[PDB]
Design a binder for these strands. Structure first.
Ligand code: K
Ligand code: K
Ligand code: MG
Ligand code: MG
Ligand code: MG
Ligand code: MG
Ligand code: MG
Ligand code: MG
Ligand code: MG
Ligand code: MG
Ligand code: MG
Ligand code: MG
Ligand code: MG
Ligand code: MG
Ligand code: MG
Ligand code: MG
Ligand code: MG
Ligand code: MG
Ligand code: MG
Ligand code: MG
Ligand code: MG
Ligand code: MG
Ligand code: MG
Ligand code: MG
Ligand code: MG
Ligand code: MG
Ligand code: MG
Ligand code: MG
Ligand code: MG
Ligand code: MG
Ligand code: MG
Ligand code: MG
Ligand code: MG
Ligand code: MG
Ligand code: MG
Ligand code: MG
Ligand code: MG
Ligand code: NA
Ligand code: NA
Ligand code: NA
Ligand code: NA
Ligand code: NA
Ligand code: NA
Ligand code: NA
Ligand code: NA
Ligand code: NA
Ligand code: NA
Lengths: 399, 220
RNA sequence: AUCGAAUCGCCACCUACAAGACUGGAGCUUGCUCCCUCGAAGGCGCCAAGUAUAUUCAUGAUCACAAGACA
RNA sequence: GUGGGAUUGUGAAGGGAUCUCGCAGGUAUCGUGAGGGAAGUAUGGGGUAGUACGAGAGGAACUCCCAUGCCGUGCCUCUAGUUUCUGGGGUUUGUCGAACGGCAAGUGCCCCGAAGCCAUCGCACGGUGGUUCUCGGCUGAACGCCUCUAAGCCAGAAGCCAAUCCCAAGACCAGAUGCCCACU
RNA sequence: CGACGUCGCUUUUUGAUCCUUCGAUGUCGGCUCUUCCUAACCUAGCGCCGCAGAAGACGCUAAGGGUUGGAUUGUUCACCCACUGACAGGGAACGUGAGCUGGGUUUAGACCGUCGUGAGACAGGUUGGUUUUACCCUACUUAGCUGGAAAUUGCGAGAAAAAGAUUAUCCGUGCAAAGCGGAGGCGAGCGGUGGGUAGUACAUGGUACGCUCAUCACC
RNA sequence: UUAAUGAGAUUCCCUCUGUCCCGAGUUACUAUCUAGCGAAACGACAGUCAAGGGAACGGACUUGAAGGGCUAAGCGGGGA
RNA sequence: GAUGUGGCCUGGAGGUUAGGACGAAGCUUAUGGCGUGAGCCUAAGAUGGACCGGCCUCUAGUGCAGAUCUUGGUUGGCGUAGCAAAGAUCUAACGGAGAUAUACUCAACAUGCAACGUUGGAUACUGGAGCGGGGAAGGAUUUCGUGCCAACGGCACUCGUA
RNA sequence: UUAGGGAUAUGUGGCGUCAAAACUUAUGGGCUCAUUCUCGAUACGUGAAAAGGGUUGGUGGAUUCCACCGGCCCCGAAAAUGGAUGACGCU
RNA sequence: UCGAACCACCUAGUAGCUGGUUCACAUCGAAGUUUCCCUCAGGAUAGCUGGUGCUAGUAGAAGUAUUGUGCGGUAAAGCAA
RNA sequence: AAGUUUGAAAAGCACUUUGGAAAGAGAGUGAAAUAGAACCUGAAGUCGUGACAAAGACAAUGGAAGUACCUCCAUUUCAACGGCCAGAACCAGCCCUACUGCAUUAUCCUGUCGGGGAUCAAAAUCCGGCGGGCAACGAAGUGCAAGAAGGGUCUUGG
């Protein structure tokens, strides 16, 4: 008979436990349409940092129609992935079972370190017997039989892809063992999927071959961790009055007399953050090329200044974006340096917002350390001019 | 999946490939409760039973009556912690296993042994297809148990409407199984016919007094 | 390699399928008549590889888990 | 059988005998997904339109598309808050003879302050199929006729179920794999 | 909608009883938080009206979602201001005091009125008046290690596996077809790892590729 | 009735503010982990639930439903 | 609730019969046998060290599971709660058993840690209403030197009002 | 209604499984369909009325229908943790 | 330590009230009702029970019938008594 | 509160060894150091350790019947012998068998006349007469049975 308000938190994200993995993993793939061409559905990226952009909006009826807006964006570095294997799945009354794996003839050191805790001091025998066997005629026959089994019984075909940390030449991402994920091949018949996958073997796949610029994607990633947290932060319950004996930041009543136990719907202290999330409908604002190929990464048709996607001073705690990258509108779960998965969208992409063609007019590259007011180092140089240390440097130059 | 010790010991012993005495029951068009009772009593008697085609069990009444029964059962759940609550299984073979379990002393070791002697399948999986002639339970068959004017439900349809998601998989697999089995049966028709004609001519080749003996006991 | 076990029907003919208000087939008169493969057996297996001119069995002594079991 | 241990309490040293235990798995990935959880929900504006209805006064709704509450899950580019980076300055009393360097006032005090954390105080994102209710029909008897039902069918609610989402093999996965070992 | 009659239902009121508790089950309200019910206020569909439209009345399915901010009052109730789609009603030991708070109630101090000769009384008013303990079990929340299908044992053998001299005695394909195509040693084949050399490819330090010498294995 | 006085009771106004909208960030000391030291309360036996009956609110009883073992930090639903 | 019992049991007495250093009482038990039972009796002590059993009768402070029972001991909780006001110590040398403490390999790290008293130096605090210097009350050797660290100084000690 | 043991046979209650017994007896007759409250299987007792309407019975009239009376089923029939013919289930 | 301090004693104060009350099995086995009581949480008193027996062991028996003979105003009936 | 109650004598553990010491390991005394000093006996409870038994989660304990493994226990038997296990025979007593006679039927059984019925015509179902009667299969499920003597006894004792 009391005053009413909704409960705190979403019981569908239970338990608030630490995620089993640090990598974002797709728990489902888009519905497979056999009418389309065979195509990959996912890609692993690394979060570098955030900035903001200006664009004009194409949305008739809106008060911002034909008007500039500024959008925060997230930059995710996407070095190409390497396809090392093919797996097939057959459907049974108890769910999908993998038929087998067709391994590539050659694997990178980075892929093989994933099988070790201490690679440098190990014997480094991973895949050696497999190489010596598959190379022969009995091995060729076994591979042919596995491929024929894929053709005969598989309804689902996925590729085994791994990341290239040597190409992701990042100093703070300490890991050197490649990240491995199964990427599902959608489109076409099963034979067509197998042909695409077999062509992909031992090859590099670039993020622009999986995703196009103005499309949207879903992001699988794990959120930033906070360790043990109380109910106020973890659940959003109210703080108690100042007058409260023995503590304020808690739930006053954790239950009625009956049931004579505590329900699972009551907010408790515990792990907060480090949870897996799937975060659909992130618009791709840009798929950039690596700076060693195209250094004018942040240049647009309206801002002719030559600049890269890296802000002055670098991304804080991350460094330089050296590879291909993806500009996503808004935010994604997880901190910088964390590997994440971009998945082709599962929700229907027919709204005006999701179909809108994105054209960037300005990309902010000012310092992310302390109220950056210069877009480029040349702008700062022309503000300040000759400083004392530059004069000393020239004085040394003349002698 | 046997341990390496089990395989090594079997290799040492020189014993052959063994299979326990197992009865395979085709539950298509069987009354759910009556088949469950018969199977439970036989399990307490030590029998090893595999039941196939649990998706084609029957319950008396319209499908909606029995789906509503299932939904009533589904809402039973431990409110303070639904994990550890009643676990509601949607698959038809799971439903049959639960029905049999409720007809056993499941909280004794003897009842547990009996329940672990039962294997339930939807359709007829390939590991069962060739193990021998399957059996029926005459006192639990629909065509003698239900007056045919009454509506009845097929267990798989109810299950798929209450959450079972493998109906189409089992349907396609059963179609493939029947097609393969019918091809294998149309072939070997010549072998069966050869054996029939062989017995017919053996009659004209055996000694006559034996033929008369067969005649008086109804075999010739 | 412990290890002695309890278990005692095999099969490459059952090991495909559907229906029981219609079961092999017809007919018209529609519940009877006519035809047949005549509608109540999965095949073997049970001591001569086959139905007969045979051929080792003990004393393991009158019951005992069959003292033996790749049919 | 192989090996390693050990028997019951009254010395020592050798012999048996008998128990007990080990005799095949380790370790590293990618997955499956039964079961459980479960979430999105409202308002307004544009237009429909001042039209349908109406003597007149008055006066609607949906395709659509533009926002906004609430709730949920995140994020830190911006703006705001926070500073023991006691960062850089400034300033009081005391104090090392002075300047210097500072130091004490449990962070002296004041201004500005990165990084991090963080606010509906900021920013982003929140999806699809069945199956039924009530009810309305179709075909159609019982019962000439009729009838929405009786046997069949159709359409159908913010309901229920599943998908998507979260945990996940005591759900004991004979799912697939890398490498040693054992078996061979 | 419904007189006067009549039949229920419910335990959200109060009474009646005195069954449990008097070697003690913390007692009103609020706050906080979760859950449940429906006799439905709003939100979704649908009937019907005296239903022209707009606004509404009554009913049906429906409890998935939602159901405010304030003045006076200890209050629950109330009723006033205002917002709103709406500001529905209940249960959970009159949910919830080792969760709080302590305004009320209910000790000792004190004042008043009335009563009493008096000490004192009041179901009347007033003011002031200690809110104790969790490190045990379970529950719940997170967080580690670890056996285990005869749920630790039996050696007690069941694959959502293949398909054959009884899974042995080859590999592919094909329908569990018809057939069809490959399959003492030296040398050869096929490859794994090292030398020489030569483009090229891929995101461009690091792998693959053609030729030759070496070794290694398997055949 | 009363100026003055009051850690007396009450109402309103200005100022002011984390009292609140609605919470956020920082510090010291704890908790926490380690070395040394080391108690008490309490303790029938013990501890997963639903319903049912029952001294009319069960941890034990009836019928169902759960339940692999051992642990660290918390927490105040129950242990009437 | 009443009553019976050549019913059981315990400490003493009058009798009568035995036993014990070749081991009494007591105590221990997968230690058997007997009895419906209270209990009795044997065995074995790799237990003990000096008294004591049976039977008839007499006699009494004569039988325990519980009284918020009495006294002593133990015990889970538990290596737990905690030992958080009064700001604080650092460094070298000396002293000390208190160390630089080791199987093979091994140069040293990764295999002796943590803690002491004194002197010197550094840093800080008390801040004269003082962890200053003297008295009453109260205490009565706590004063001083040397020695010593079993117990005590809720951690420690080579130090101490021990 | 009771010394402690066996055999045999009963009582009340049962005979689909739990759970001994019709391994689901008969070569017995009828009746009954029920959709979120679950129809029924509830002696004591532990889930109901006034009132009304699918099927198959009866009585009394009229030309198949009229009225009336039973059986079983249905409606009337709304509460708070998820739950109870004891459970599964049975037609 | 205070709506009558503390110490020792009278004092093991009294309690119709609360709590406790130590071996076996054998034969039997209740009452919560009556009357009186400042009696109602207690007693006396009779009943129910046990133990003793005594007396000529079938007697002066009976929670039952039958037959004979008395008693009755409740159920029903009545309001035309 | 508190028995000094070691042992017959103190014979109260020289000496070696390592440790700072306390002590430890040896060696001695003593009949005995589980007689080593507030030391006879040395219980219960609690704890350590070794060997073993196993064991999910049914809190544990408990009852009753078995079984597996153990058993420092008891008792019995060990040859013209057993008091142990088991199987068949007989006997006595019980307990299940297999075998059924007497009475009764009439609202009944049969034939034929008459009717009445129904379909193409019949027969039948049915009703009254008449003449006969046993529906006699294992007649009938109606009343009462009085029929002596195969199989069970680890349900008894020989
Ligand atoms: K410690
Ligand atoms: K019996
Ligand atoms: Mg972090
Ligand atoms: Mg307080
Ligand atoms: Mg649910
Ligand atoms: Mg044998
Ligand atoms: Mg900041
Ligand atoms: Mg300072
Ligand atoms: Mg109490
Ligand atoms: Mg209490
Ligand atoms: Mg309480
Ligand atoms: Mg309190
Ligand atoms: Mg409080
Ligand atoms: Mg006060
Ligand atoms: Mg005052
Ligand atoms: Mg005052
Ligand atoms: Mg606050
Ligand atoms: Mg703590
Ligand atoms: Mg309960
Ligand atoms: Mg209890
Ligand atoms: Mg508690
Ligand atoms: Mg008594
Ligand atoms: Mg005495
Ligand atoms: Mg006494
Ligand atoms: Mg007692
Ligand atoms: Mg502690
Ligand atoms: Mg100072
Ligand atoms: Mg002083
Ligand atoms: Mg100390
Ligand atoms: Mg049975
Ligand atoms: Mg039946
Ligand atoms: Mg029952
Ligand atoms: Mg005082
Ligand atoms: Mg006394
Ligand atoms: Mg008492
Ligand atoms: Mg008696
Ligand atoms: Mg009367
Ligand atoms: Na699920
Ligand atoms: Na700022
Ligand atoms: Na600031
Ligand atoms: Na007066
Ligand atoms: Na805990
Ligand atoms: Na005692
Ligand atoms: Na501390
Ligand atoms: Na009784
Ligand atoms: Na019947
Ligand atoms: Na001696």
């Amino acid at each position: 008979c009391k005053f009413e308000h909704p409960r705190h938190g979403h019981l569908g994200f239970l338990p608030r436990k630490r995620s089993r993995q640090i990598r974002g993993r797709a728990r489902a793939f888009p519905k497979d349409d056999a009418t389309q061409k065979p195509h990959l559905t996912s890609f692993m990226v690394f979060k570098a940092g955030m900035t903001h952009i200006v664009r004009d909006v194409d949305r008739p009826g809106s008060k911002v129609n034909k008007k500039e807006v500024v959008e925060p964006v997230t930059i995710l570095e996407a070095p190409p992935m390497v396809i090392v294997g093919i797996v097939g799945y057959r459907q049974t009354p108890v769910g999908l079972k993998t038929i087998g794996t067709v391994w590539a003839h050659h694997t990178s050191v980075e892929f093989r370190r994933r099988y070790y805790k201490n690679w440098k001091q190990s014997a480094q025998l991973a895949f050696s017997r497999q190489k010596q066997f598959a190379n022969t005629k009995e091995g060729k026959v076994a591979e042919a039989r596995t491929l024929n089994a894929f053709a005969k019984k598989a309804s689902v075909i996925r590729v085994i892809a791994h990341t290239q940390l040597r190409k992701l030449r990042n100093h703070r991402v300490g890991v050197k063992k490649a990240h491995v994920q199964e990427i599902q091949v959608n489109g076409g018949s099963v034979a067509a999927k197998i042909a695409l996958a077999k062509s992909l073997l031992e090859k590099e796949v670039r993020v622009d071959s999986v995703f196009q610029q103005s499309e949207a994607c879903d992001v699988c990633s794990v959120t930033k961790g906070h360790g043990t947290e109380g109910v106020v932060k973890r659940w959003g319950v109210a703080c108690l009055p100042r007058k409260t004996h023995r503590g304020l930041r808690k739930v006053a009543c954790i239950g009625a007399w009956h049931p004579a136990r505590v329900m699972y719907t009551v907010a408790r202290a515990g792990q907060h953050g480090y949870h897996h999330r799937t975060q659909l409908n992130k618009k791709i604002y840009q798929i950039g090329r690596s700076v060693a190929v195209e250094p004018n990464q942040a240049t647009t048709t309206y801002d002719l200044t030559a600049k890269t996607i890296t802000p002055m001073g670098g991304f804080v705690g991350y460094g330089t974006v050296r590879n291909d990258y993806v500009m996503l509108k808004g935010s994604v779960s997880g901190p910088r340096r964390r590997v994440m998965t971009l998945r082709r969208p599962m929700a229907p992409q027919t709204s005006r917002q999701l179909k809108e063609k994105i054209v960037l007019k300005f990309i902010d590259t000012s310092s992310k350390i302390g109220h950056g007011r210069f877009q480029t180092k040349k702008e700062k140089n022309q503000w300040f001019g000759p400083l004392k240390k530059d004069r000393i440097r020239r004085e040394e130059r003349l002698r | 999946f046997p341990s390496r010790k089990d395989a090594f010991r079997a290799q040492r012993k020189g014993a052959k490939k063994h299979r326990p005495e197992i009865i395979v029951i085709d539950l298509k068009d069987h009354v759910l409760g009556r088949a469950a009772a018969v199977v439970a009593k036989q399990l307490l008697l030590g029998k090893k039973i595999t039941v196939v085609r649990c998706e084609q069990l029957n319950i008396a009444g319209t499908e909606i009556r029995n789906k509503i029964k299932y939904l009533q059962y589904l809402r039973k759940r431990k409110l303070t912690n639904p994990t550890k609550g009643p676990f509601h299984h949607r698959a038809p073979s799971d439903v049959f296993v639960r029905t049999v379990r409720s007809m056993l002393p499941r909280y004794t070791k003897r009842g547990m042994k009996a329940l672990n002697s039962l294997v339930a399948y939807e359709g007829i999986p390939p590991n069962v297809v060739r193990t021998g002639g399957r059996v029926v339970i005459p006192r639990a068959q629909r065509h003698v148990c239900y007056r045919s004017e009454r509506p009845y439900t097929v267990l798989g349809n109810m299950c798929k409407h209450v959450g079972w998601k493998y109906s189409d998989v089992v349907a396609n697999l059963e179609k493939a199984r029947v097609e393969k089995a019918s091809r294998h049966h149309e072939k070997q028709a010549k072998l069966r016919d050869a054996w029939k004609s062989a017995r017919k001519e053996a009659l004209a080749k055996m000694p006559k007094h034996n033929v008369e003996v067969l005649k008086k006991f109804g075999y010739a």
